[PDB]
Scaffold this motif. Sequence first.
Motif, PDB file in Angstrom:
ATOM      1  N   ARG C  40       0.823  -1.199   0.000  1.00 38.35           N
ATOM      2  CA  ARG C  40       0.000   0.000   0.000  1.00 38.35           C
ATOM      3  C   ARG C  40       0.860   1.252   0.000  1.00 38.35           C
ATOM      4  N   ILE C  41       1.804   1.334   0.935  1.00 40.11           N
ATOM      5  CA  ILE C  41       2.555   2.570   1.110  1.00 40.11           C
ATOM      6  C   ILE C  41       3.462   2.806  -0.086  1.00 40.11           C
ATOM      7  N   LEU C  42       4.120   1.750  -0.552  1.00 45.94           N
ATOM      8  CA  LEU C  42       4.828   1.772  -1.820  1.00 45.94           C
ATOM      9  C   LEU C  42       3.971   2.319  -2.944  1.00 45.94           C
ATOM     10  N   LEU C  43       2.867   1.639  -3.225  1.00 43.57           N
ATOM     11  CA  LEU C  43       2.149   1.908  -4.458  1.00 43.57           C
ATOM     12  C   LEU C  43       1.270   3.143  -4.393  1.00 43.57           C
ATOM     13  N   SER C  44       1.131   3.775  -3.226  1.00 44.30           N
ATOM     14  CA  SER C  44       0.215   4.898  -3.095  1.00 44.30           C
ATOM     15  C   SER C  44       0.726   6.041  -2.230  1.00 44.30           C
ATOM     16  N   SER C  45       1.951   5.975  -1.702  1.00 43.56           N
ATOM     17  CA  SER C  45       2.429   7.051  -0.842  1.00 43.56           C
ATOM     18  C   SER C  45       3.922   7.355  -0.945  1.00 43.56           C
ATOM     19  N   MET C  46       4.647   6.841  -1.938  1.00 40.53           N
ATOM     20  CA  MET C  46       6.079   7.121  -2.020  1.00 40.53           C
ATOM     21  C   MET C  46       6.318   8.400  -2.818  1.00 40.53           C
ATOM     22  N   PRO C  47       7.162   9.325  -2.358  1.00 40.28           N
ATOM     23  CA  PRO C  47       7.349  10.571  -3.106  1.00 40.28           C
ATOM     24  C   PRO C  47       8.296  10.444  -4.286  1.00 40.28           C
ATOM     25  N   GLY C  48       8.050  11.299  -5.269  1.00 43.39           N
ATOM     26  CA  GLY C  48       8.810  11.305  -6.500  1.00 43.39           C
ATOM     27  C   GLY C  48       8.242  12.321  -7.462  1.00 43.39           C
ATOM     28  N   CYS C  49       9.056  12.644  -8.462  1.00 43.25           N
ATOM     29  CA  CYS C  49       8.722  13.636  -9.470  1.00 43.25           C
ATOM     30  C   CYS C  49       8.298  12.957 -10.760  1.00 43.25           C
ATOM     31  N   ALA C  50       7.446  13.632 -11.526  1.00 41.64           N
ATOM     32  CA  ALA C  50       6.957  13.023 -12.756  1.00 41.64           C
ATOM     33  C   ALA C  50       6.286  14.069 -13.635  1.00 41.64           C
ATOM     34  N   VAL C  51       5.954  13.633 -14.847  1.00 40.38           N
ATOM     35  CA  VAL C  51       5.408  14.491 -15.894  1.00 40.38           C
ATOM     36  C   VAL C  51       3.962  14.816 -15.542  1.00 40.38           C
ATOM     37  N   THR C  52       3.694  16.086 -15.245  1.00 38.56           N
ATOM     38  CA  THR C  52       2.345  16.539 -14.937  1.00 38.56           C
ATOM     39  C   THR C  52       1.644  17.057 -16.188  1.00 38.56           C
ATOM     40  N   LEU C 128      10.384  12.014 -35.932  1.00 38.36           N
ATOM     41  CA  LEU C 128      10.130  12.958 -37.013  1.00 38.36           C
ATOM     42  C   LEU C 128      10.433  12.239 -38.319  1.00 38.36           C
ATOM     43  N   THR C 129       9.378  11.899 -39.063  1.00 40.02           N
ATOM     44  CA  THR C 129       9.534  11.042 -40.235  1.00 40.02           C
ATOM     45  C   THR C 129      10.358  11.737 -41.308  1.00 40.02           C
ATOM     46  N   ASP C 130       9.940  12.933 -41.707  1.00 39.09           N
ATOM     47  CA  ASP C 130      10.744  13.799 -42.550  1.00 39.09           C
ATOM     48  C   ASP C 130      11.584  14.726 -41.682  1.00 39.09           C
ATOM     49  N   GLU C 131      12.736  15.123 -42.219  1.00 37.85           N
ATOM     50  CA  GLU C 131      13.607  16.056 -41.513  1.00 37.85           C
ATOM     51  C   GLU C 131      13.023  17.458 -41.484  1.00 37.85           C
ATOM     52  N   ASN C 132      12.223  17.811 -42.493  1.00 46.58           N
ATOM     53  CA  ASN C 132      11.719  19.173 -42.601  1.00 46.58           C
ATOM     54  C   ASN C 132      10.823  19.537 -41.426  1.00 46.58           C
ATOM     55  N   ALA C 133      10.134  18.559 -40.847  1.00 45.77           N
ATOM     56  CA  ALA C 133       9.328  18.806 -39.663  1.00 45.77           C
ATOM     57  C   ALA C 133      10.221  18.972 -38.439  1.00 45.77           C
ATOM     58  N   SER C 134       9.911  19.972 -37.614  1.00 49.54           N
ATOM     59  CA  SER C 134      10.684  20.271 -36.415  1.00 49.54           C
ATOM     60  C   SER C 134       9.748  20.818 -35.346  1.00 49.54           C
ATOM     61  N   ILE C 135      10.081  20.531 -34.085  1.00 50.12           N
ATOM     62  CA  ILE C 135       9.160  20.683 -32.969  1.00 50.12           C
ATOM     63  C   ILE C 135       9.774  21.573 -31.899  1.00 50.12           C
ATOM     64  N   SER C 136       8.890  22.155 -31.090  1.00 52.66           N
ATOM     65  CA  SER C 136       9.255  22.818 -29.848  1.00 52.66           C
ATOM     66  C   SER C 136       8.179  22.501 -28.823  1.00 52.66           C
ATOM     67  N   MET C 137       8.578  21.884 -27.710  1.00 52.55           N
ATOM     68  CA  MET C 137       7.661  21.554 -26.631  1.00 52.55           C
ATOM     69  C   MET C 137       8.286  21.950 -25.305  1.00 52.55           C
ATOM     70  N   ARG C 138       7.446  21.954 -24.279  1.00 53.19           N
ATOM     71  CA  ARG C 138       7.882  22.188 -22.914  1.00 53.19           C
ATOM     72  C   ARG C 138       7.060  21.329 -21.974  1.00 53.19           C
ATOM     73  N   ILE C 139       7.718  20.818 -20.942  1.00 54.97           N
ATOM     74  CA  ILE C 139       7.211  19.696 -20.167  1.00 54.97           C
ATOM     75  C   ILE C 139       7.269  20.080 -18.702  1.00 54.97           C
ATOM     76  N   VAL C 168      -1.269  14.752 -17.965  1.00 54.22           N
ATOM     77  CA  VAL C 168      -0.972  13.326 -17.995  1.00 54.22           C
ATOM     78  C   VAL C 168      -1.124  12.760 -16.590  1.00 54.22           C
ATOM     79  N   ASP C 169      -1.493  11.484 -16.519  1.00 49.18           N
ATOM     80  CA  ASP C 169      -1.706  10.833 -15.236  1.00 49.18           C
ATOM     81  C   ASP C 169      -0.377  10.729 -14.503  1.00 49.18           C
ATOM     82  N   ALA C 170      -0.307  11.327 -13.321  1.00 50.82           N
ATOM     83  CA  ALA C 170       0.959  11.463 -12.615  1.00 50.82           C
ATOM     84  C   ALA C 170       1.443  10.130 -12.063  1.00 50.82           C
TER      85      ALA C 170
END
Lengths: 79, 78, 228, 51
Positions: C40-52, C128-139, C168-170
């Motif tokens: 229980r404590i493992l799977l539901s109460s351990m601290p850590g960082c993740a993609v919100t 990126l399938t073609d090289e011409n496509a290029s992205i900018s994201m922030r997380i 996203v599901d934390a």
Amino acid sequence: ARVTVQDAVEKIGNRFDLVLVAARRARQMQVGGKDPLVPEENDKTTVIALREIEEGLINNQILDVRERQEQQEQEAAEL
Amino acid sequence: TTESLRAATHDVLAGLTAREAKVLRMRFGIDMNTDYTLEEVGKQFDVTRERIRQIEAKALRKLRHPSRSEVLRSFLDD
Amino acid sequence: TEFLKPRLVDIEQVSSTHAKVTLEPLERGFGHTLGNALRRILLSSMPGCAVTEVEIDGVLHEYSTKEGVQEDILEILLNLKGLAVRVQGKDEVILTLNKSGIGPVTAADITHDGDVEIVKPQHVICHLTDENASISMRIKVQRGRGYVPASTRIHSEEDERPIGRLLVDACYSPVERIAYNVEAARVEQRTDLDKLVIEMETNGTIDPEEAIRRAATILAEQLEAFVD
Amino acid sequence: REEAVVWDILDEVIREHPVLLNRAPTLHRLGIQAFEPVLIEGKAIQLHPLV
DNA sequence: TAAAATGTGATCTAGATCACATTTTAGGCAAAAAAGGCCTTGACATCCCACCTCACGTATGCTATAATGTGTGCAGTCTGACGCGGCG
DNA sequence: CGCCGCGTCAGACTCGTAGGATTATAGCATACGTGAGGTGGGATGTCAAGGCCTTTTTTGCCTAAAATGTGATCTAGATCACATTTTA
């Protein structure tokens, strides 16, 4: 090797010849006290027989060769 | 039980002087179909009879001797 | 009082993140207790960082897509839950990734703040399938404990979010799996005794032994008021 | 007298020593099988349900 | 500069010296005699053997009024197929 | 040839439960052998003192002979309160 005897059959080919050869070896070992080849690992002689036959170290031909050679050299030692 | 017993007995017999062991064998029918006597020990070894009785006694000391007794001690409860 | 205590016998370790623990011997009535409570404590109460949260340019909602890309948005989002992240000074950070060319988008391409460790920098995100496509994201990465889904979060969240910012599901708690097994172990006259065999398998960010150590640490840290 | 080494030596010999099981009526050859032993503190055999 | 090290020298004090006579005593070499090892002897004790040994048990014989064909306490009938001997 | 009657022959497998039988049969006399009992008697087995030999325990003894005692004559160490004197 312990719980399943398949790969041993894949080496030789038959259950019956496998149990006969294995029993021959483990009667060289249960009574003759000759040493093993594969490590011991706290196992009765059945398992060590089945392993030595699994990895290809004991065979009816090979037993014949060994007993043959030691017997003949003994015959030379007698004379 | 009889077998391990008897082998242990012979292994005790091996450790003695010759006349001791052989006399104490044939005098009791051991190891043979025979049953030979104090008198007949006289006839075979030499006519001396009751020094064989004293020899029997001395052997019973040599062998009873609780360093050898304990292979026999389990057979006390027989 | 004639208690018995266990002796930690083995920690069998397949990889850094997969771990096994045999543990014997115990009085009867504890293996299930410990296995459950730790699970229980493992799977539901351990601290850590993740993609919100996420924010990508030219990108509106997961049902939409980017052009010149193998994935939809969703497979990427799954390639973001599976992320090894550590913050080291803060409780929150916002990373950036600006990529071009045909580079199967690894986490290695990300620009890292000094207080950020990605334990799996090879971790793939997109393609990126073609090289011409290029992205900018922030997380957005945030520090929490346990697991909390973005669905329940929007249920929780009334503060307005725009189209362009995603959620996203934390996966705060760094465990991916645990399960325990109560076997019976022999003391000479006593075969009514029980051992507790555990498989734990986590993400990066923790060695499992340390995780358990922290769990029992927490639990005793709850019990000090009643040892009193 | 049923001393302690009785049990340790019992477990010593029993290992790798299979044993046969049989239920009546022994209709077909799978009515009789060879298992491995596991020692337990009771007077009732346990069995692997699938067989 | 505090605190430990360094000269006064006459007045002593427990062991060493030093050549030679007498013990001892080994240690170890010859052995006397005693106590095991060897046998014998007398005396006892207990027999093994068998050699008998009578009582109780046992193998065998007749009993003369006369009397002359069983049964006798059961089974409960299972049944479907296959051989074989009558059965026309 | 083809009944018909009679007779022969199998009737799943491992465990458990109980103890258990019954009728009536003449009688006494003769004479012989075998079982349970005595009974001296070879003969075996035991137990306590004595003669052969070697070993062991005292114990002579044999001479190298180094050791144990005789005591007056020394000697090279050993002290203590005062007077500095050096070193960290």
